[PDB]
């Protein structure tokens, strides 16, 4: 996260770290949506242009964390993966359309002060909150700058951007399964996700019921925190029928 700040303890208890077993390293962010399901970006697991195709046994998920590099004894919980599910129309060839994946854990994780699931949006919450200017929150352990790394989880609040401005900022084809967020050059505030934050959550606190909803997944960007560029996020609600199908079946 660029131009963010240190998270408070328990501020993002759904935040998940995707961790490579060997070499031991941070791969991506992710989020806890139930005691057995974790949501992330498909490109965190499958990206053939870079010879990335992780299997269940390659990875662990670490839940309840605050410190990036410490083993947080008696606080974090480490879970093995039962199965990965990647959206069948995830477009890794072109523009990362439908950049979403689910991971089912081998055993349920125990909730605690530090471990608790985020809600997924219904149609009405999405319609009400996914408006230009409305702010969401991005969290992660990714780099602090495009070109270093944080001691603890970072947090930044960023406004959703009008779709024409998103499109006009890039040569990439933007789809309805994406939205963009970030400040404009003239707005005098900054912030973005960066390397290591992708797959993590973009959340909004509903003013109707005071619950946190995951509206986006950190998907892609052109650099980090560049003037005139924006972060692009998977539109979780638009893909929720797939999420429900996977959980119902499996």
């Amino acid at each position: 996260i660029v131009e963010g700040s240190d998270a408070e303890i328990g501020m993002s208890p759904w935040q998940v770290m995707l961790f490579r077993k060997s070499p031991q390293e941070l791969l991506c962010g992710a989020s806890l949506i139930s005691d057995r399901w974790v949501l992330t970006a498909a490109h965190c697991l499958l990206y053939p242009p870079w010879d990335k195709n992780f299997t269940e046994n390659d990875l662990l998920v670490r839940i309840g964390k605050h410190s990036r590099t410490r083993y947080e004894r008696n606080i974090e919980k480490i879970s093995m993966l039962e199965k990965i599910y990647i959206h069948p129309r995830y477009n890794w060839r072109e523009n990362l359309d439908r950049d979403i994946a689910l991971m089912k854990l081998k055993k349920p994780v125990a909730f605690s002060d530090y471990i608790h699931p985020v809600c997924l949006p219904d149609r009405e919450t999405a319609a009400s909150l996914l408006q230009a200017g409305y702010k969401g929150r991005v969290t992660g352990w990714g780099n602090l700058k495009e070109t270093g790394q944080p001691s603890v989880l970072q947090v930044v609040n960023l406004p959703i951007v009008e779709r024409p401005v998103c499109k006009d900022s890039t040569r990439i084809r933007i789809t309805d399964n994406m939205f963009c967020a970030g400040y404009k050059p003239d707005e005098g505030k900054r912030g973005d996700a960066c390397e290591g934050d992708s797959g993590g959550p973009f959340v909004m606190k509903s003013p109707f019921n005071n619950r946190w909803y995951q509206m986006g997944i950190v998907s892609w960007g052109e650099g980090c925190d560049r003037d005139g560029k924006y972060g692009f996020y998977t539109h979780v609600f638009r893909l929720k029928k797939w999420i429900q199908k996977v959980i119902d079946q499996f």
Partner: peptide, 10 residues
């Protein structure tokens, strides 16, 4: 520089 995790998880 990640701290080693317990062997049980590996």
């Amino acid at each position: 520089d990640f701290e080693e995790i317990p062997e049980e998880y590996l």
